[PDB]
Amino acid sequence: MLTRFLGPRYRQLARNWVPTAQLWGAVGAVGLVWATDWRLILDWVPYINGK
Amino acid sequence: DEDAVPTLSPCRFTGSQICHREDGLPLAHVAIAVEGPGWAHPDNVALQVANAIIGHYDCTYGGGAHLSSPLASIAATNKLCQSFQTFNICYADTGLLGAHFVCDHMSIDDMM
Amino acid sequence: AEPEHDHRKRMGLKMLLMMGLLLPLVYAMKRHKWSVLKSRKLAYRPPK
Amino acid sequence: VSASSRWLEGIRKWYYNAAGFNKLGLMRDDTIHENDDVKEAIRRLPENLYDDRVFRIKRALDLSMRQQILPKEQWTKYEEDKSYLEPYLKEVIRERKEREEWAKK
Amino acid sequence: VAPTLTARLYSLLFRRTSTFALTIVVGALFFERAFDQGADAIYEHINEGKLWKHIKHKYE
């Protein structure tokens, strides 16, 4: 019954938190990547090619 | 006209606290504010609209729980105060922007 | 008796270099928050 | 009265200065350890003393925090040290002992 | 240039706990590496007791 959250205001609310939720994903991405020294991802980064 | 007519120098806003503790009074008064732009700044209108959204409250207000302002409504429902008011005091180039409130000794935290 | 000998001393170097950066840094963080209590001024104003 | 009293008095004045609470603007009775008898006596103090006592203690805790001390001028001189709490405490003890005597019978 | 440095740093990267975090994580990446270079380079300079031994014994 998630219809309670369906309306104009809720839609404005979602847009307002978008940049924040996006940036929070940027943090989690780099966060995992750096913490596991992601071979796959890190190779693209200049200066972090310690091989 | 002529000599001896000064202009006003801007006033430095500091951002600090002054607590006058007195347990003999039965309700606490608290007034918090940030630095406002001052008279001429067009920004005042928008500031005034946000304030209006928070608004005011007083214990004799009819309609408590159903009030639009979440502050007011939560305030009224949990009896977190006797009154509150937002404000925007304008001076040349500076101002006080905030709210003032009156409440019981055990409600100051929640109200804040 | 201690094959690790050299490795630890490398970490030890890092441990001193790191702590030589973290220590003052945390101090200043703690200094900054206690700021409020270090400079607080009191006044007593009794009636009469 | 003579050299004798002054000597004990000066031995006392010496310890006092050594105890060093006066450096924090405190008074002997401010440092008293709070127990039941003491709590009651603190309770019986009249408004003025109770207020002064709290400010004194606050001044001290505040100093003991930044580990500073008061200017020499403002230390609390022996002599000038008021045993404000004493009479109250004595009466609180004197009351308790009465219940205690009564409890033996 | 100097006040505006700490300022711009606050403006573009510090308010939003988002960017504030985005930067420290990104700042931890570059740092971890640059620290391990200098640190090891330091460990080497005060030594030279192993590694250049390799140039001798093998190379085949």
Curated annotation (Swiss-Prot), chain A:
Statement: the UniProt record of this protein carries the keyword Zinc: no
Topological relation to the membrane, as annotated: Single-pass membrane protein
Keywords assigned: Electron transport, Membrane, Mitochondrion, Mitochondrion inner membrane, Respiratory chain, Transmembrane, Transmembrane helix, Transport
Coiled-coil regions listed: none
Primary site of residence: mitochondrion
Annotated localization: Mitochondrion inner membrane
Domain of life: Eukaryota
Transmembrane domains' residue ranges: 13-35
Positions on the Mitochondrial matrix side per record topology: 1-12
GO cellular component, one term: mitochondrial inner membrane
Classification via Gene3D superfamilies: 1.20.5.220
BP GO annotations: mitochondrial electron transport, ubiquinol to cytochrome c
The UniProt record lists the keyword Kinase: no
Assembly and interaction partners: Component of the ubiquinol-cytochrome c oxidoreductase (cytochrome b-c1 complex, complex III, CIII), a multisubunit enzyme composed of 11 subunits. The complex is composed of 3 respiratory subunits cytochrome b, cytochrome c1 and Rieske protein UQCRFS1, 2 core protein subunits UQCRC1/QCR1 and UQCRC2/QCR2, and 6 low-molecular weight protein subunits UQCRH/QCR6, UQCRB/QCR7, UQCRQ/QCR8, UQCR10/QCR9, UQCR11/QCR10 and subunit 9, the cleavage product of Rieske protein UQCRFS1.
Function recorded in the entry: Component of the ubiquinol-cytochrome c oxidoreductase, a multisubunit transmembrane complex that is part of the mitochondrial electron transport chain which drives oxidative phosphorylation.
Family: Belongs to the UQCR11/QCR10 family.
Name of the protein: Cytochrome b-c1 complex subunit 10
Organism placement in taxonomy: Eukaryota, Metazoa, Chordata, Craniata, Vertebrata
Curated annotation (Swiss-Prot), chain B:
GO molecular function: metal ion binding
Chain ranges passing through the membrane: none
Domain of life: Eukaryota
UniProt GO cellular component terms: mitochondrial inner membrane; mitochondrion
Disulfide cross-links: none
Subcellular localization(s) per the UniProt record: Mitochondrion inner membrane
Keywords: Acetylation, Electron transport, Membrane, Mitochondrion, Mitochondrion inner membrane, Phosphoprotein, Respiratory chain, Transit peptide, Transport
Subunit structure: Component of the ubiquinol-cytochrome c oxidoreductase (cytochrome b-c1 complex, complex III, CIII), a multisubunit enzyme composed of 11 subunits. The complex is composed of 3 respiratory subunits cytochrome b, cytochrome c1 and Rieske protein UQCRFS1, 2 core protein subunits UQCRC1/QCR1 and UQCRC2/QCR2, and 6 low-molecular weight protein subunits UQCRH/QCR6, UQCRB/QCR7, UQCRQ/QCR8, UQCR10/QCR9, UQCR11/QCR10 and subunit 9, the cleavage product of Rieske protein UQCRFS1.
Function: Component of the ubiquinol-cytochrome c oxidoreductase, a multisubunit transmembrane complex that is part of the mitochondrial electron transport chain which drives oxidative phosphorylation.
Similarity comment text for this entry: Belongs to the peptidase M16 family. UQCRC1/QCR1 subfamily.
Name of this protein: Cytochrome b-c1 complex subunit 1, mitochondrial
Organism classification: Eukaryota, Metazoa, Chordata, Craniata, Vertebrata
Residues of the full protein shown: 258 to 369 of 480
Swiss-Prot record, chain D:
Family listed: Belongs to the UQCRB/QCR7 family.
Domain of life of the native organism: Eukaryota
Repressor is among the record's keywords: no
Organism: Bos taurus (Bovine)
Protein's cellular compartments: Mitochondrion inner membrane
Keyword presence, Membrane: yes
Gene Ontology BP terms: mitochondrial electron transport, ubiquinol to cytochrome c
Membrane topology category: Peripheral membrane protein
Subunit-level organization: Component of the ubiquinol-cytochrome c oxidoreductase (cytochrome b-c1 complex, complex III, CIII), a multisubunit enzyme composed of 11 subunits. The complex is composed of 3 respiratory subunits cytochrome b, cytochrome c1 and Rieske protein UQCRFS1, 2 core protein subunits UQCRC1/QCR1 and UQCRC2/QCR2, and 6 low-molecular weight protein subunits UQCRH/QCR6, UQCRB/QCR7, UQCRQ/QCR8, UQCR10/QCR9, UQCR11/QCR10 and subunit 9, the cleavage product of Rieske protein UQCRFS1.
Protein name per its UniProtKB record: Cytochrome b-c1 complex subunit 7
Gene Ontology cellular-component annotations: mitochondrial inner membrane; respiratory chain complex III
Function according to Swiss-Prot or TrEMBL: Component of the ubiquinol-cytochrome c oxidoreductase, a multisubunit transmembrane complex that is part of the mitochondrial electron transport chain which drives oxidative phosphorylation.
Modified residues (N6-succinyllysine): K72, K82
Gene, per the UniProt record: UQCRB
Annotated keywords: Acetylation, Electron transport, Membrane, Mitochondrion, Mitochondrion inner membrane, Respiratory chain, Transport
Modified residues (N6-acetyllysine): K13, K72, K77, K82, K90
SUPFAM superfamilies: 14 kDa protein of cytochrome bc1 complex (Ubiquinol-cytochrome c reductase)
Curated annotation (Swiss-Prot), chain E:
Membrane topology: Single-pass membrane protein
One BP annotation, GO: mitochondrial electron transport, ubiquinol to cytochrome c
Membrane topology, Mitochondrial intermembrane segments: 47-60
Residue ranges crossing the lipid bilayer per the database entry: 21-46
Keywords: Electron transport, Membrane, Mitochondrion, Mitochondrion inner membrane, Respiratory chain, Transmembrane, Transmembrane helix, Transport
Residue spans, topological domain Mitochondrial matrix: 1-20
Annotated localization: Mitochondrion inner membrane
A Pfam family annotated for this UniProt entry: UCR_UQCRX_QCR9
Chief subcellular location: mitochondrion
InterPro entries (alphabetical): QCR9, QCR9_sf
SUPFAM superfamilies attached to this UniProt entry: Subunit X (non-heme 7 kDa protein) of cytochrome bc1 complex (Ubiquinol-cytochrome c reductase)
Residues making up the signal peptide according to the UniProt record: none
Highest taxon in the source lineage: Eukaryota
GO CC, one annotated term: respiratory chain complex III
Assembly and oligomerization: Component of the ubiquinol-cytochrome c oxidoreductase (cytochrome b-c1 complex, complex III, CIII), a multisubunit enzyme composed of 11 subunits. The complex is composed of 3 respiratory subunits cytochrome b, cytochrome c1 and Rieske protein UQCRFS1, 2 core protein subunits UQCRC1/QCR1 and UQCRC2/QCR2, and 6 low-molecular weight protein subunits UQCRH/QCR6, UQCRB/QCR7, UQCRQ/QCR8, UQCR10/QCR9, UQCR11/QCR10 and subunit 9, the cleavage product of Rieske protein UQCRFS1.
Functional summary from the UniProt entry: Component of the ubiquinol-cytochrome c oxidoreductase, a multisubunit transmembrane complex that is part of the mitochondrial electron transport chain which drives oxidative phosphorylation.
Family statement: Belongs to the UQCR10/QCR9 family.
Protein name listed in UniProt: Cytochrome b-c1 complex subunit 9
Source species of the chain: Bos taurus (Bovine)
Gene name, Swiss-Prot/TrEMBL: UQCR10
